Design a protein around this ligand. Structure first.
Ligand code: NI
Length: 341
């Protein structure tokens, strides 16, 4: 059965609720982004209206084979009417095609569902600026002050400089980047750009990337691995065994691997600055864990909420334990008392 924090009161709507069978009273199913915890349950056999971004709708049609007649893509930053209710989709600064959803309820209540997001001050000047929000359904992934990480721009600087140095010292080094979902494409695109290479990958992952409206993409990616010195592999293969095996396959073109695992937060964040990050090394293989996040840090989250001043907050992440729920509720009250709303 569908949990309460996936239902929008006063509407026939649910958000990211495809794994519960037919939800009683649901006339339209919204999908915030194409990540498997959120789309779980969709397929070519789904026959209700799905509302989403253009990019999410390209992925539904080409990767999950959802029939076109049930996909309802909406433009961003545009007031639209759905089953008699005004909605707006906003950029969530998560993965490609990810949105927040503003619902303007018939009774005057305004609700923001962030989906998954990385809060940013740029959001304080979208259509959110113009009106009050009564209820916020909040991505609370990293809702504790221990969760600090650098900007995406500092992390990419590190990666470009690390890759460029290594391959200039050794022109026979290969760079490998791990992936398991959409998101974090800047990591591998920025490294390939500095090296003057295309990114090489499987047909399945190439297909996924061709659904994302990224400009000049035919210029940056390829299925011809032999022509590329930046390769993408599944995240599970980014270990010494899996990389040794890959190097065998390249037929003596390369004699060294430098590999990147973009993670979210890890506890080495609570000690080490990005500048000071070092790899794990075995022989001619080095692996860098880099803290490239597509979710809000604690401070980014707190700033957004203190700017928005919602009347009620409903967490959508970490909701399964009483200790997590109590922790989150204590921070929400702090923020409200400090800011005065
Ligand atoms: Ni996500």
């Amino acid at each position: 059965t569908c949990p309460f924090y996936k239902k929008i009161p006063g509407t026939g709507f649910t958000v990211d609720a495809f794994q519960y069978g037919v939800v009683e009273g649901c006339t339209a199913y919204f999908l915030t982004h194409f990540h498997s915890d959120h789309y779980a349950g969709l397929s070519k056999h789904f026959t209700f209206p799905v509302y989403c971004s253009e990019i999410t709708g390209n992925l539904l049609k080409n990767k999950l084979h959802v029939q076109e007649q049930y996909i309802h893509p909406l433009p961003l930053d545009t007031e639209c009417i759905v089953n008699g209710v005004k909605v707006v989709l906003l950029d969530a600064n998560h993965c490609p095609g990810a949105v927040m959803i503003l619902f303007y309820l018939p009774n005057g209540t305004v609700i923001l569902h962030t989906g998954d997001f990385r809060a940013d001050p740029s959001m304080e000047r979208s259509l959110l600026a113009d009106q009050k929000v009564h209820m916020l359904y909040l991505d609370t992934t990293y809702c504790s002050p221990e969760y600090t990480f650098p900007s995406q721009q500092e992390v990419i600087r590190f990666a470009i400089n690390t890759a460029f140095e290594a391959v200039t010292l050794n022109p026979h080094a290969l760079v490998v980047c791990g992936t398991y979902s959409i998101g974090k494409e800047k990591v591998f695109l920025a490294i390939a750009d500095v090296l003057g290479s295309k990114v090489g990958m499987s047909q399945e992952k190439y297909k996924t990337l061709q659904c994302l409206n990224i400009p000049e993409i035919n210029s940056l990616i390829t299925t011809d691995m032999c022509s590329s010195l930046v390769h993408l592999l599944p995240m599970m293969q980014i270990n010494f065994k899996g990389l040794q095996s890959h190097l065998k396959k390249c037929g003596g073109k390369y004699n060294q691997i430098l590999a990147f695992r973009p993670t979210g937060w890890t506890h080495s964040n609570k000690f080490t600055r990005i500048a000071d990050v070092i790899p794990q090394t075995k022989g001619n293989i080095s692996i860098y864990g880099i803290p490239y996040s597509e979710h809000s840090s604690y401070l980014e989250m707190k700033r957004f909420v203190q700017w928005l001043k919602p009347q009620k907050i409903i967490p959508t992440v970490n909701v399964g334990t009483w200790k997590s729920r109590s922790t989150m509720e204590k921070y929400f009250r702090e923020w409200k008392l400090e800011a005065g709303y």
